[PDB]
């Protein structure tokens, strides 16, 4: 979806970079770990910058692992993380980039929203919508849908994959539901409000079939039961809103299907997590089904339902709004490059001063 300018690497490739042989730098880091001594963030930065081959990436992956399991893991720099993804794309190692991103806990690769779009867009153009979905799920796990550009790309991948996937497993429903909900909340357009109702519906299905702990456990989601209540509220809000807002017809069918399925179904971690006084969600389904029909009637009466499919609505939204976002993000990208350049120079200067002092210390000693 993104333009060639967005994914162009002329600016990154023109960065001022120090020339250090990887073999020499490898030895320095190896000695520090043998002596249980901290390694500098500038040291790991120089290694990633001077990667020159596909084989070198494999060695850097090992050293990024070592840095994560070292005293100075927190100091891994943003530009080092961005250069890693840029190097992986350059030499054809996209699988390695996705591998480290999925295994963030081990390697410490937490890219920014711009880097996420670069990796996610590569897969989209190649037609690998299974790997692109993995990037979307990783963005959701980190709750990093802040930049508008990432929200549009994530919704395009999700809806395109959902259309192909007629059958959804409970884990898939949970992952898709969370990704839709978090991305949808940011957007106030028709596509955004449809994704919120779509996301709450899927999560509500998993809540009433497998329990509320399946939804929130290990997920960036709340633990309070009543996800189908959140879905119905979206319908009630649009119907009563003074402004004219519309919910796609496709989502309304999904919620109707979920309500019907749940309504008429066919070691020591066994706890009742809800108070006895509070009504269980299953007992509330009869009332929930009445609200849905009433809301649907009011929406159709007010002509607030969009017959167009969600995949077609999202495609139009991406075409109209994504071009503007690319210009804004690219301007911020240039500013970040200059900020990173200055911060890197400061670290190099500070290193030189301490080394000079180290000579003076030995002279005194």
């Amino acid at each position: 979806l993104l333009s060639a300018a967005y994914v162009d690497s002329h600016q990154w490739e023109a960065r001022e970079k120090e020339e250090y042989h990887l073999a020499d730098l490898a030895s320095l880091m190896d000695k520090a770990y043998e002596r249980k001594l901290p390694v500098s963030s500038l040291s790991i930065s120089r290694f990633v910058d001077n990667i020159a081959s596909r084989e070198d990436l494999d060695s850097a992956e090992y050293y990024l692992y070592k840095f994560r399991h070292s005293p100075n893991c927190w100091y891994l720099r943003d530009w080092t993380i961005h250069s890693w993804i840029r190097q992986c794309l350059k030499y054809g190692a996209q699988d390695k980039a996705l591998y480290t991103l999925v295994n963030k806990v081990q390697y410490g690769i937490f890219p920014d929203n711009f880097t996420f779009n670069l990796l996610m867009d590569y897969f989209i153009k190649k037609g690998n919508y299974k790997d692109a979905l993995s990037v979307v799920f990783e963005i959701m796990m980190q709750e990093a849908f802040d930049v508008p550009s990432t929200q549009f790309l994530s919704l395009y991948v999700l809806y395109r994959c959902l259309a192909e996937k007629t059958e959804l497993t409970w884990e898939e429903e949970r992952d898709f539901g969370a990704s839709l909900l978090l991305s949808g909340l940011k957007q106030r357009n028709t596509v955004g409000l449809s994704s919120q109702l779509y996301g709450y519906a899927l999560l509500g299905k998993v809540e009433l079939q497998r329990g509320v702990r399946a939804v929130y456990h290990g997920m960036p989601l709340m633990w309070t039961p009543g996800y189908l209540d959140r879905a119905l509220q979206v319908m009630e809000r649009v119907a009563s809103s003074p402004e004219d807002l519309k919910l796609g017809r496709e989502v309304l069918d999904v919620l109707d299907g979920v309500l019907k399925v749940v309504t008429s179904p066919d070691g020591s971690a066994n706890l009742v997590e809800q108070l006895d006084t509070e009504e269980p969600e299953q007992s509330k389904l009869p009332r929930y089904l009445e609200r849905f029909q009433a809301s649907r009637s009011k929406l159709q009466e007010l002509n607030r339902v969009e017959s167009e499919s969600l995949l077609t609505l999202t495609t139009q939204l991406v075409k109209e709004k994504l071009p503007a976002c690319e210009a804004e993000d690219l301007a911020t990208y240039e500013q970040k490059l200059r900020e990173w350049h200055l911060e890197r120079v400061q670290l190099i200067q500070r290193e030189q001063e301490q080394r000079e002092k180290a000579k003076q210390e030995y002279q005194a000693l």
């Binding site: 005293p71 893991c73 980190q142 702990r213 020591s268 971690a269 066994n270």
Partner: protein, 216 residues
Amino acid sequence: RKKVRPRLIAELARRVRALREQRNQPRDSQLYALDYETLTRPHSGRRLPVRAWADVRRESRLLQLLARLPLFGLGRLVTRKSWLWQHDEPCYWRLTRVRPDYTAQNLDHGRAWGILTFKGKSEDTAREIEQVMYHDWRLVPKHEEEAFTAFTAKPEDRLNSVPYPPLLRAMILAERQKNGDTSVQEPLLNLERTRMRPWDYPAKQETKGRAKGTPV
């Protein structure tokens, strides 16, 4: 006297022993490791109490949540399942600093710092967090923070003064008459100066003890 003589071996022993302790200090990844099949700590062979078994299998530790987040979740809010069950009002930590245990192969053990908000009332300074190795922590989602942290304080209704005990009240009134003070005022105790925190209130981790490094 002068027949009391030096004990060089005793002095040598004390210093030598203390040095080894500093050299061979254990790490959080070892002291707080657990065997989930038996719910027993391998280091000391200490089997966890019975009331904790369900949560040990059903809940996560703090740095298990934070290891998956950028910057180890600095600025994020974290609550405890025990607090969620006991108190209706929001109880959480606002993370400020986080020191993972690099030795751990998953960075799942360490220490953290933050600002406490217990039962809706927030402290003014950051301090170290206790019970970080417990299976009780729940990370709050960013989109749910505003609804989670919303609190409206109710007017305090717990009595501020109470009567004196029956005998101690009679001794006070008797002293009044003896000294010439004539009054019918009822002696009253003031409870504002001495109000007790809840029993589950977070304690000072900085002054807490740490287990020794001798395995059982």
